[PDB]
Design a protein around this ligand. Structure first.
Ligand SMILES: CNC(=O)[C@H](CCCCNC(C)=O)NC(C)=O
Ligand SMILES: [Cl-]
Length: 130
């Protein structure tokens, strides 16, 4: 329906705004663009599902997220990819893990404070009904 389309449009607007807020945070700059396969030729071979905030924006715009849950699965990937690719005790790896996982945590915290659970519930019900 029209109303269902309106619902998904509001979802997109909400997700773009959350994503923008993460993207403008200085700590998160390394996650704003895909890893360049110049600097990092092994990345694309170790990490099977690369994810970054610019890809998140593309996916929003292509209508790939129909619920906040599906968006958070991609946010989770940003964290878990960093944990997996940068597991070492050295400070360079520790800083990327800290920042990737602070991204996760910040996205969760914004959503906990600002997403209405009945709005999420509606998105899930429309998605399921397809
Ligand atoms: C081939 N490896 C490199 O180029 C690495 C840098 C990779 C950092 C990993 N990025 C992410 C976003 O997880 N080297 C140096 C200098 O840290
Ligand atoms: Cl830095």
């Amino acid at each position: 329906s029209m109303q269902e389309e309106d619902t998904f449009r509001e979802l997109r607007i909400f997700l773009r705004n959350v994503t923008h807020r993460l993207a403008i945070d200085k700590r998160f700059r390394v996650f704003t663009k895909p890893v360049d396969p110049d600097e990092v030729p092994d990345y694309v071979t170790v990490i099977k599902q690369p994810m970054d905030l610019s890809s998140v924006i593309s996916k929003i715009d292509l209508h790939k997220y129909l619920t906040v849950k599906d968006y958070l699965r991609d946010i989770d990937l940003i964290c878990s990819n960093a944990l997996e690719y940068n597991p070492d005790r050295d400070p360079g790896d520790r800083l990327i893990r800290h920042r990737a996982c602070a991204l996760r945590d910040t996205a969760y915290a914004i959503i906990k404070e600002e997403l209405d659970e009945d709005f999420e519930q509606l998105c899930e019900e429309i998605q399921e009904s397809r």
